[PDB]
Design a protein around this ligand. Sequence first.
Ligand SMILES: NC(=O)C1=CN([C@@H]2O[C@H](COP(=O)(O)OP(=O)(O)OC[C@H]3O[C@@H](n4cnc5c(N)ncnc54)[C@H](OP(=O)(O)O)[C@@H]3O)[C@@H](O)[C@H]2O)C=CC1
Ligand SMILES: Nc1nc(N)c2ccccc2n1
Ligand SMILES: [Ca+2]
Ligand SMILES: [Ca+2]
Ligand SMILES: [Ca+2]
Ligand SMILES: [Ca+2]
Ligand SMILES: [Ca+2]
Ligand SMILES: [Ca+2]
Ligand SMILES: [Ca+2]
Length: 159
Amino acid sequence: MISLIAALAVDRVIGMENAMPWNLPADLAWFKRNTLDKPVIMGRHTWESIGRPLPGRKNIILSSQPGTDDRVTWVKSVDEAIAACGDVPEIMVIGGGRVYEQFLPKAQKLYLTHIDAEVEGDTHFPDYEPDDWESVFSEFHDADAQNSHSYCFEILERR
Ligand SMILES: NC(=O)C1=CN([C@@H]2O[C@H](COP(=O)(O)OP(=O)(O)OC[C@H]3O[C@@H](n4cnc5c(N)ncnc54)[C@H](OP(=O)(O)O)[C@@H]3O)[C@@H](O)[C@H]2O)C=CC1
Ligand SMILES: Nc1nc(N)c2ccccc2n1
Ligand SMILES: [Ca+2]
Ligand SMILES: [Ca+2]
Ligand SMILES: [Ca+2]
Ligand SMILES: [Ca+2]
Ligand SMILES: [Ca+2]
Ligand SMILES: [Ca+2]
Ligand SMILES: [Ca+2]
């Protein structure tokens, strides 16, 4: 079972110059909650954006070229990435834009943080068909002293 987890600002913007331009500790806690003890698949740009291995998770990196870090697992295709996870209940695809586009047809669940932020970006979440997904979890939060935007955590399941 493949799931995508992503944080989306206005117009499905997810990144700008290898960074997520917002500071939402509540999204970091949600991300950790939902990915811990699950293999994580990421694109090479995301691996460089994060900057280090994610603890308590098997880290699988997609690249057409050989790996440059043995602390993580390197793969050269979507099918090889899935295979490297082994027999696990759930695989988490953590980005970026290009990796989400490829795993979206195979995904059964979307863990989305809808951020109320105006972000000029260079990376977007794929334009998912609303008719194909059903909202099973939806928890809205107002901004506070730690989180500068209002945000909604949503879980969508493929109909
Ligand atoms: N808001 C959010 O939730 C998140 C946002 N982001 C943002 O997204 C951006 C990064 O996204 P993006 O630029 O799309 O890059 P990605 O992180 O999706 O990485 C793409 C790279 O991964 C490799 N790759 C992808 N698919 C394959 C494949 N099928 N086979 C082999 N290699 C593959 C390629 O590496 P190579 O070139 O080596 O072949 C490719 O250049 C950053 O701005 C980051 O901040 C990232 C995660 C989460
Ligand atoms: N919701 C969400 N999804 C991600 N894929 C992510 C990647 C790294 C750090 C914060 C993140 N938050
Ligand atoms: Ca900033
Ligand atoms: Ca490239
Ligand atoms: Ca060795
Ligand atoms: Ca881009
Ligand atoms: Ca439509
Ligand atoms: Ca803030
Ligand atoms: Ca159904």
